[PDB]
């Protein structure tokens, strides 16, 4: 079999959206910060025995340009909603991303995964339980990741594909 999924990576600036994506696509960790405007990637993977093409849209962490960002959300089938475990503001921003996705998709059931990135760092400010509780209240998975060590990177993207597939089954 083969299928294809449009994945969109969203979240506040500097949380590691690009570093997570670049680990998945290019298998290296970018230590320098290169702020995103917009980037797109394609990769063929096998998830649960089912081959698929991932189209990943790496978006900029910013709340300006609502109409452009709404178009990303209309076209996207699932969303990785990323915060950094050492940036409380980025965690507090998550509910705004979920609200925008639901409004644009006109649905309360949109494939989404909550990603707590930078778990390698010793400067945590957001507790795992806090993030788990938020994800539970949304009915979505929570994955802790480190783009630096690659921990959880495949899991985050593959889990999102699983969420899309479960949504398509309804």
């Amino acid at each position: 079999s083969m299928t294809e999924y449009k994945l969109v990576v969203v979240g506040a600036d500097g949380v590691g959206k690009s570093a997570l994506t670049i680990q998945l696509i290019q298998n290296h960790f970018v230590d320098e910060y290169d702020p995103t405007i917009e980037d797109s990637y394609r990769k063929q993977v096998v998830i649960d025995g089912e081959t698929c093409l991932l189209d990943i849209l790496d978006t900029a962490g910013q709340e300006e340009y609502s109409a452009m960002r709404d178009q990303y959300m209309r076209t996207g089938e699932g969303f990785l909603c990323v915060f950094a475990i050492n940036n409380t503001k980025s965690f507090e921003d998550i509910h705004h991303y979920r609200e925008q996705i639901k409004r644009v998709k006109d649905s309360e059931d949109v494939p989404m995964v909550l990603v707590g990135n930078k778990c390698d760092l010793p400067s945590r400010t957001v507790d795992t339980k806090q993030a788990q509780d938020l994800a539970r209240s949304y009915g979505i998975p929570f994955i802790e990741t480190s783009a630096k060590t690659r921990q959880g990177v495949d899991d985050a993207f593959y889990t999102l594909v699983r969420e899309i597939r479960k949504h398509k089954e309804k």
């Binding site: 910060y33 290169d34 702020p35 995103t36 405007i37 917009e38 980037d39 300006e64």
Partner: protein, 166 residues
């Protein structure tokens, strides 16, 4: 102008001269912000724009540069410290040639700046406009062609020399 300084950038493409862009800096209306750009253009404080890159060029919108500290689009510093406050929003992003401060939110002006190649009115009230291209808009239009949709440039566009005129 009898009041507003004129500064110039000699633009280079992979080291080769492209041409000169001069700017009127609106010290009459935006004095602190104009003075920062003037001083960074002369290098008189011991640091400034000479050698730095236009790291983000998006056709239809703007050419952005001015990171002379990190050299990667994340840096910059003013003559007043790392950051200074938004001085005023008297002037707007009315069209091509407008020179305005880049920032990372309220009161974070440093050295990064952008030159508009179109009206960018959604930036009004959030970025401080402080100057305009005087001569060499054709050179800015030539720079714009090295950009791309995400701002990455296909050749390295730099300020090979800069200073104050008149």
């Amino acid at each position: 102008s009898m009041v507003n300084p004129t500064v110039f950038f000699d633009i280079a493409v992979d080291g080769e001269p492209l041409g000169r862009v001069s700017f009127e800096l609106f010290a009459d209306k935006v004095p602190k912000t104009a003075e920062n750009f003037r001083a960074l253009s002369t290098g008189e404080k011991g640091f400034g724009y000479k050698g730095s890159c236009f790291h983000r060029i998006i056709p239809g919108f703007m050419c952005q540069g001015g990171d002379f500290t990190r050299h990667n689009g994340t840096g910059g510093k003013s003559i007043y410290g790392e950051k200074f406050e938004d001085e005023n929003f008297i002037l707007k992003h009315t069209g091509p040639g407008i020179l305005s401060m880049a920032n990372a939110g309220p009161n974070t002006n440093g050295s990064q700046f952008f030159i508009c190649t179109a009206k960018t009115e959604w930036l009004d009230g959030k970025h401080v406009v402080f100057g305009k291209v005087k001569e060499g808009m054709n050179i800015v239009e030539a720079m714009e062609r090295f950009g791309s949709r995400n701002g990455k440039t296909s050749k390295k566009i730099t300020i090979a020399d800069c200073g104050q005129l008149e």
